[PDB]
């Protein structure tokens, strides 16, 4: 099955969100998650793709 | 107020100056006056006396 | 005085008879938003 | 308990006797219009001949209060002291004083009302005794000077605590602090019970909704995080908005709109909770501006859902009631308009009730789909029902057409429906 | 026999009756004023 | 096909809402003098949205 979301991680902790399922040059991202201050290390969906759970190290 | 209305002031004030086609309009300021006014109602809105 | 011996007075009715107003989230597939359910194991 | 706190309920319930002259220089000084000095001097005929005056004002505004001229603004409730009448003649003496402050809480911007109600304050000194009533009518003011000159010569209630700061306070009490009050338990069983005889006596007016709905609205908001608080809140609030939608008042059933969306997005609910709440929606959905917003809040609740029967039929006596208070004609305009709200799983339900029931709007089926885009499982399930009409259903021109609908949009997933049922 | 309506009211004033007043608040019933 | 790929059909059919958090309609108080009530509630509605 194809993946619907895409996050992506930095050093300053943000984690932008993308909606994968709806394309162009420059693609806003649907969130810009902040609540971590730290390098993000992990970042790994639940296998049904409703809980994202990021992690500093 | 006066810290946050200054800050808008510089704002409005340097879109009227170096703005090479401004728009004898005003919505840069009337938008940032909003601004203001939302830090105003919240600012005075607190109550320090505990209820 | 009283006595009980579209009609407006549904929503009314349906209070009274349930207790629990919240929807059993074991039957719904999607989780809750803010609330999660976690235990240690 | 001590000597001491005895005395002080024996002092409470003595309050407005007058027994020395220290005590009445106190009561007789509590005034609306008049200082404290300016207010000792004056004399009960004096202020009942302003009262008088003002109340005919009042009554050239609005017929209803020239009744009280007969009652309570009487030259024989001159000489009316409250302390020597009986309990019950004093309940009777409260039923009236409660049906004036319901008329004066819509006219509190005119003048006269506060030379009227300085005759009740003085003589009847409602401030010390309906000192409940006089808040609740005048809460919606907070912000203008009237109400501060009533919590200066008020004594508040257990209930109204959170307003004992701003007593002879120079600035006016905050809306932050407005939401405090109400969100007490106690309090919103109070108020409910007020506005309920405003809804009773058809006395409520647009500030009154506004404010009402703002505090109920903030009230979910402070209590979000709080799941079991908001429980505790279904009760009542609720129970309130049926009440309102029962009012042929069309600003009465716009603030039930407001308050019951903001519990469905705060809170989820049964479906069953969720279906009895059109009925009464649409049990006495007659004014324009109600039923536009109406159709607003019935897709918002529907969008809440998140159980199996997400996107079910309605009911067959729900979706009779729906189709009468709103034509397709008026839905199809509801799909025209760009800024139309979500309302897919409604869509899909209220979809899956044509079928079900009527057999002539099937060409209407094939214009609403164009009009919404539906997600993958609710055309999977309008696909699934389809196949079911033609079946027992006889073929039809309009029904193949939207087979043949589906047939250009996603053909593999009506082979899939196809696969599954057949 | 009985005294005319008018001096009822005059009897009314002068002893400073309430019983017509007081009448009035018991059969105030709250809807009829709305 | 299987139940499975119906039960994720499911979950990818939910579309984001705005959560009501605390400080929603706060400001509603601000402006909610000489306004009808329609116009009212449509304000909900957007902050809603």
């Known amino acids: 099955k194809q993946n619907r979301w895409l996050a992506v991680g930095s050093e300053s902790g943000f984690v932008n969100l993308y909606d994968r399922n709806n394309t162009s040059s420059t693609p806003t991202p649907v969130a810009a998650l902040?609540?971590?201050?730290?390098?993000?290390?992990?970042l790994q969906f639940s296998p049904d793709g409703q809980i994202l759970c990021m992690a500093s190290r | 107020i006066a810290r946050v209305l200054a800050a808008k002031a510089a704002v409005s004030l340097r879109y009227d100056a170096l703005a090479e086609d401004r728009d004898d309009s005003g919505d840069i300021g009337l938008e940032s006056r909003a601004k203001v006014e939302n830090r105003l109602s919240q600012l005075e809105g607190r109550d320090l006396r505990t209820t | 005085?009283?006595?009980?011996?579209?009609?407006?007075?549904a929503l009314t009715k349906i209070l009274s008879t349930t207790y629990n107003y919240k929807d059993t989230?074991?039957?719904?597939?999607?989780?809750?938003?803010?609330?999660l359910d976690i235990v240690r194991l | 308990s001590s000597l001491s706190d005895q005395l002080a309920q024996v002092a409470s319930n003595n309050a407005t006797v007058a027994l020395d002259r220290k005590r009445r220089q106190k009561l007789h000084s509590a005034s609306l219009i008049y200082n404290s000095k300016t207010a000792a001097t004056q004399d009960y005929d004096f202020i009942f001949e302003n009262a008088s005056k003002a109340l005919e004002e009042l009554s050239q505004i609005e017929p209803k209060f020239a009744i009280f001229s007969r009652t309570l603004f009487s030259e024989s409730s001159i000489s009316l002291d409250?302390?020597?009448?009986?309990?019950?003649?004093?309940?009777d003496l409260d039923n009236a004083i409660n049906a004036y402050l319901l008329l004066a809480s819509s006219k509190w911007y005119l003048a006269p009302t506060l030379h009227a109600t300085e005759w009740l304050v003085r003589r009847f000194q409602?401030?010390?005794?309906?000192?409940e009533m006089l808040l609740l009518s005048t809460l919606n003011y907070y912000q203008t000077p009237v109400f501060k000159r009533i919590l200066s010569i008020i004594k508040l209630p257990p209930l109204f605590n959170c307003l004992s700061n701003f007593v002879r306070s120079e600035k006016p009490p905050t809306a932050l602090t407005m939401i405090k009050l109400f969100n007490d338990m106690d309090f919103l069983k109070l108020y409910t019970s007020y506005l309920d005889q405003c809804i009773k006596?058809?006395?409520?007016?647009?500030?009154?909704?506004?404010?009402?709905?703002?505090?109920?609205?903030?009230?979910?908001?402070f209590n979000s995080n709080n799941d079991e608080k908001l429980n505790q809140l279904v009760p009542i609030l609720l129970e309130i908005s049926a009440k309102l939608l029962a009012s042929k008042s069309k600003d009465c059933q716009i603030a039930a709109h407001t308050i019951l969306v903001?519990?469905?997005?705060?809170?989820?609910?049964?479906?069953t909770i969720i279906l009895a709440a059109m009925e009464t929606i649409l049990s006495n959905l007659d004014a324009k501006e109600a039923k536009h917003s109406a159709l607003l809040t019935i897709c918002k609740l529907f969008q809440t859902l998140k159980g199996?029967?997400?996107?079910?039929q309605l009911p067959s006596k729900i979706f009779k009631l729906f189709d009468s208070k709103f034509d397709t004609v008026s839905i199809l305009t509801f799909l025209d308009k760009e800024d139309k709200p979500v309302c897919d799983k409604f869509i899909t339900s209220y979809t899956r009730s044509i079928a079900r029931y009527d057999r002539s709007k099937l060409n209407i089926i094939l214009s609403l789909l164009k009009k919404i885009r539906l997600e993958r499982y609710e055309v999977r399930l309008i696909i699934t029902d389809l196949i079911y009409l033609s079946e027992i259903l006889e073929d039809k021109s309009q029904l193949v057409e939207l087979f043949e609908y589906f047939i250009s949009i996603n053909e593999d997933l009506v082979l899939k429906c196809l696969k599954s049922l057949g | 026999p009985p005294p005319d309506e008018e001096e009822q009211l005059l009897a009314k004033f002068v002893f400073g009756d309430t019983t017509d007043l007081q009448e009035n608040l018991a059969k105030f019933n709250a809807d009829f004023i709305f | 096909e299987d139940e499975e790929d119906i039960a994720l059909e499911f979950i990818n059919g939910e579309k984001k809402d705005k959560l009501v958090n605390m400080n929603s309609f706060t400001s509603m108080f601000d402006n909610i003098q000489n306004v009808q009530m329609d116009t009212f509630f449509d304000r909900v509605m957007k902050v809603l949205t």
Do not use: W
């Not at chain 4, 409602?126 to 000192?131: D, F, G, L, M």
């Open chain 4, 126 to 131: 409602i401030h010390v005794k309906n000192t």
């Open chain 4, 201 to 221: 006596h058809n006395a409520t007016y647009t500030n009154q909704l506004l404010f009402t709905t703002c505090c109920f609205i903030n009230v979910v908001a």
């Open chain 3, 1 to 9: 005085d009283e006595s009980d011996s579209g009609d407006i007075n």
């Open chain 4, 262 to 271: 903001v519990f469905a997005t705060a809170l989820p609910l049964k479906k």
């Open chain 4, 308 to 312: 199996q029967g997400n996107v079910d």
């Open chain 3, 25 to 35: 989230l074991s039957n719904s597939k999607l989780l809750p938003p803010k609330k």
């Open chain 1, 34 to 42: 902040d609540q971590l201050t730290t390098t993000i290390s992990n």
């Open chain 4, 82 to 91: 409250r302390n020597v009448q009986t309990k019950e003649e004093i309940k």
